[PDB]
Amino acid sequence: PQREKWSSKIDFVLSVAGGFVGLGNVWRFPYLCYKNGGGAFLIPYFIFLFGSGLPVFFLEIIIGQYTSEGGITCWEKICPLFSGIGYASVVIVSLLNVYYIVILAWATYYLFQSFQKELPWAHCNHSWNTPHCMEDTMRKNKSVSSTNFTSPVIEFWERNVLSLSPGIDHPGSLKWDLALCLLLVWLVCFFCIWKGVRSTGKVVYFTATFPFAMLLVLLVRGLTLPGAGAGIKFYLYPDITRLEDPQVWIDAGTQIFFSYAICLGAMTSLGSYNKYKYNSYRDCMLLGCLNSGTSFVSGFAIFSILGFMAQEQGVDIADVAESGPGLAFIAYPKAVTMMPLPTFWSILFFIMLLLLGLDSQFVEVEGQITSLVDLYPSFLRKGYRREIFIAFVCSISYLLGLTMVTEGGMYVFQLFDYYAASGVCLLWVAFFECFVIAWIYGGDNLYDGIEDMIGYRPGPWMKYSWAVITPVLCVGCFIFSLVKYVPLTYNKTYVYPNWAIGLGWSLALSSMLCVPLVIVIRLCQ
Numbered sequence: 400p401q402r403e404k405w406s407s408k409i410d411f412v413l414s415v416a417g418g419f420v421g422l423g424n425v426w427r428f429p430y431l432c433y434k435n436g437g438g439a440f441l442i443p444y445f446i447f448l449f450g451s452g453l454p455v456f457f458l459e460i461i462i463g464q465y466t467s468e469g470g471i472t473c474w475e476k477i478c479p480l481f482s483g484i485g486y487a488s489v490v491i492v493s494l495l496n497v498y499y500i501v502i503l504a505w506a507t508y509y510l511f512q513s514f515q516k517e518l519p520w521a522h523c524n525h526s527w528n529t530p531h532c533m534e535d536t537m538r539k540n541k542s543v544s545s546t547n548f549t550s551p552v553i554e555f556w557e558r559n560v561l562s563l564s565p566g567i568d569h570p571g572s573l574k575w576d577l578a579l580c581l582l583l584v585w586l587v588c589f590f591c592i593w594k595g596v597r598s599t600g601k602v603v604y605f606t607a608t609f610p611f612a613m614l615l616v617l618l619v620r621g622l623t624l625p626g627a628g629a630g631i632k633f634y635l636y637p638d639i640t641r642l643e644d645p646q647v648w649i650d651a652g653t654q655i656f657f658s659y660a661i662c663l664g665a666m667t668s669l670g671s672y673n674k675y676k677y678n679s680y681r682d683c684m685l686l687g688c689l690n691s692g693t694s695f696v697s698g699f700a701i702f703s704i705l706g707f708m709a710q711e712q713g714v715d716i717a718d719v720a721e722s723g724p725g726l727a728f729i730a731y732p733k734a735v736t737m738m739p740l741p742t743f744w745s746i747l748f749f750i751m752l753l754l755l756g757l758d759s760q761f762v763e764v765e766g767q768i769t770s771l772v773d774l775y776p777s778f779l780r781k782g783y784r785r786e787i788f789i790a791f792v793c794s795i796s797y798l799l800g801l802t803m804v805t806e807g808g809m810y811v812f813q814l815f816d817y818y819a820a821s822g823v824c825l826l827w828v829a830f831f832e833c834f835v836i837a838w839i840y841g842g843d844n845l846y847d848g849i850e851d852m853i854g855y856r857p858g859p860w861m862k863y864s865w866a867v868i869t870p871v872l873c874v875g876c877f878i879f880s881l882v883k884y885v886p887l888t889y890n891k892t893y894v895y896p897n898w899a900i901g902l903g904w905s906l907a908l909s910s911m912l913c914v915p916l917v918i919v920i921r922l923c924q
């Protein structure tokens with residue numbers, strides 16, 4: 400009928416391979432682990448992984464396969480009254496795309512700036528450089544006032560790319576080059592969606608192999624760098640005392656729900672095209688193992704780079720980097736300078752970032768569009784109308800993202816990254832999914848359908864995880880965060896005014912309130 404299906408299982412595998420693999424495995428994980436002490440981030444990370452990450456991902460895949468519907472419509476046949484989880488997921492992904500494409504815009508700016516003989520961030524002698532700047536090579540000299548010194552890479556990222564304002568209360572003026580880069584990326588996405596240009600043919604081999612080969616050579620270079628042992632020890636060995644703060648637990652619980660693309664309506668859409676009699680269990684387990692291994696292995700390379708930088712700069716590891724949403728843009732551009740012929744490797748690395756980010760970008764944008772289409776199949780899922788819908792959505796998203804390319808858009812970006820598609824809202828959605836599935840629908844009723852589909856009956860390692868481990872963890876993290884409140888501080892120094900915190904809380908509540916509002920609306924009818 401109108402609903403189409405995958406031509407072969409290889410399409411599903413290659414779709415998921417780019418959909419939850421991208422910037423969240425090599426960009427968000429490093430500074431999230433770096434800010435929260437280091438090794439202490441891993442214990443709650445693995446606990447949340449084996450407690451809810453694979454279980455909820457597999458549950459979403461099974462609901463998609465068993466319902467043959469999108470993010471919003473599956474809950475209509477699962478539990479009509481507890482609908483609104485799909486609406487919250489759509490809100491989360493809509494707010495996520497806006498600031499997710501800004502990273503791609505920064506990558507495009509870096510790639511365009513890479514097209515000359517000398518990389519601009521290698522040295523600091525330009526107009527934007529402070530008199531405080533000097534090269535990292537000579538920073539450790541006893542002659543060279545050891546607190547006000549700064550590295551060329553940090554100054555470049557702070558002024559040339561960002562032009563950081565004193566605070567969110569001074570937006571400044573708009574930057575036109577960043578707006579052009581954002582428009583270019585949005586045009587590329589629109590052309591890749593409108594004409595259906597995708598990874599179909601022999602190009603999939605390159606599209607899948609090249610990022611992993613680049614990651615492997617990056618890891619080899621990082622592990623070869625001196626001072627990597629200190630970075631590895633910082634990354635692995637935990638601190639027991641830091642475990643008493645809710646921030647580490649809530650960051651670890653959010654990396655599992657973010658990198659795996661959970662609670663945003665993409666996995667159910669991807670599983671909606673699968674075959675009824677298809678063994679999704681083994682494929683889902685293998686893909687989850689691949690994703691977790693990707694995050695874990697990229698952590699080794701990036702923390703070895705951080706350890707080398709801390710060793711060369713003469714300072715400690717915890718105060719050698721930006722420790723915010725832009726740690727990768729200091730860590731990796733510093734790494735590509737050591738490799739022979741730096742320009743070629745820089746171009747390759749930025750193309751690799753663009754590829755990993757874009758395939759996911761397309762995945763979640765298409766998931767959002769399909770979820771919206773499933774609500775109105777008559778007025779959408781059409782020709783020119785479906786074109787103008789995507790065009791209007793892209794234009795609105797570009798206009799909204801224009802607010803983060805000004806001189807004071809870094810604070811807005813950090814606020815979005817903390818309150819938009821992560822934190823309390825993700826725990827809210829995951830709890831309300833696992834609770835309903837385990838208690839109202841029934842965990843034993845789903846095993847019968849699973850046996851009908853995959854052929855055999857799985858074990859109880861997941862029926863208990865959907866019913867006990869996940870709700871307890873979600874409620875505990877929520878209560879612990881509420882009891883001990885610590886305000887957000889960008890780069891440990893900036894103090895956000897009360898109105899900014901209220902704006903962030905309103906951003907989070909816009910997604911959180913969907914469930915109670917839908918419940919009361921349905922009960923009123």
Ligand SMILES: CC(C)CCC[C@@H](C)[C@H]1CC[C@H]2[C@@H]3CC=C4C[C@@H](OC(=O)CCC(=O)O)CC[C@]4(C)[C@H]3CC[C@]12C
Pocket residue numbers: 486489490493494774909
């Ligand atoms: C505004 C910020 C927080 C970003 C969120 C944007 C979207 C996720 C929102 C904005 C407007 C919402 C729409 C507003 C009105 C409706 C009509 C509503 O229709 C009904 O009440 C059901 C009718 C029926 O049963 O046919 C269905 C949800 C929908 C499409 C909403 C879906 C979610 C939308 C697109």
Ligand SMILES: CC(C)CCC[C@@H](C)[C@H]1CC[C@H]2[C@@H]3CC=C4C[C@@H](OC(=O)CCC(=O)O)CC[C@]4(C)[C@H]3CC[C@]12C
Pocket residue numbers: 567568569570571802811
């Ligand atoms: C409803 C959600 C989806 C969007 C809400 C608006 C946001 C896009 C935020 C991001 C940056 C914010 C702005 C950041 C800085 C300022 C300056 C602040 O004070 C000034 O106007 C300073 C003097 C001047 O800028 O002329 C007033 C609020 C405002 C415009 C903020 C209004 C709300 C903005 C546009």
Ligand SMILES: CC(C)CCC[C@@H](C)[C@H]1CC[C@H]2[C@@H]3CC=C4C[C@@H](OC(=O)CCC(=O)O)CC[C@]4(C)[C@H]3CC[C@]12C
Pocket residue numbers: 493494497771775791792795796799
């Ligand atoms: C806050 C930012 C991030 C939102 C960016 C995307 C929106 C501009 C898009 C996303 C989903 C869109 C909606 C998806 C589906 C429909 C149903 C369809 O209904 C109509 O033809 C009119 C409905 C009405 O009068 O509300 C077209 C409008 C609407 C609400 C769309 C309006 C524009 C929306 C909210």
Ligand SMILES: CC(C)CCC[C@@H](C)[C@H]1CC[C@H]2[C@@H]3CC=C4C[C@@H](OC(=O)CCC(=O)O)CC[C@]4(C)[C@H]3CC[C@]12C
Pocket residue numbers: 486490905909912913916917920921
């Ligand atoms: C602008 C700033 C302050 C952010 C807050 C925006 C909210 C006022 C918006 C954002 C998303 C909206 C929701 C998007 C989708 C829906 C689904 C829509 O359809 C139903 O749930 C009706 C179901 C039925 O009637 O059978 C009802 C409105 C609602 C909850 C919307 C209510 C208003 C919300 C929460």
Ligand SMILES: *[C@@H]1O[C@H](CO)[C@@H](O)[C@H](O)[C@H]1NC(C)=O
Pocket residue numbers: 524
């Ligand atoms: C820095 O620029 C000044 C101004 O032209 C020049 O005299 C100096 O040699 C430059 N130094 C380096 C290390 O590039």
Ligand SMILES: *[C@@H]1O[C@H](CO)[C@@H](O)[C@H](O)[C@H]1NC(C)=O
Pocket residue numbers: 536537540541542
């Ligand atoms: C420190 O400065 C002196 C100045 O003569 C120079 O000889 C020395 O090489 C510098 N140290 C390093 C590690 O380059």
Ligand SMILES: *[C@@H]1O[C@H](CO)[C@@H](O)[C@H](O)[C@H]1NC(C)=O
Pocket residue numbers: 530531544545547548
């Ligand atoms: C950095 O050192 C001190 C910091 O106490 C500062 O007063 C001084 O002006 C700075 N000097 C240089 C050369 O940057």
Ligand SMILES: [Cl-]
Pocket residue numbers: 423424428654655658690691694
């Ligand atoms: Cl991860």
Ligand code: NA
Pocket residue numbers: 416417418419420421422754755756757758759760
């Ligand atoms: Na990807």
Ligand code: NA
Pocket residue numbers: 419420421423424657658659660690
């Ligand atoms: Na991921």
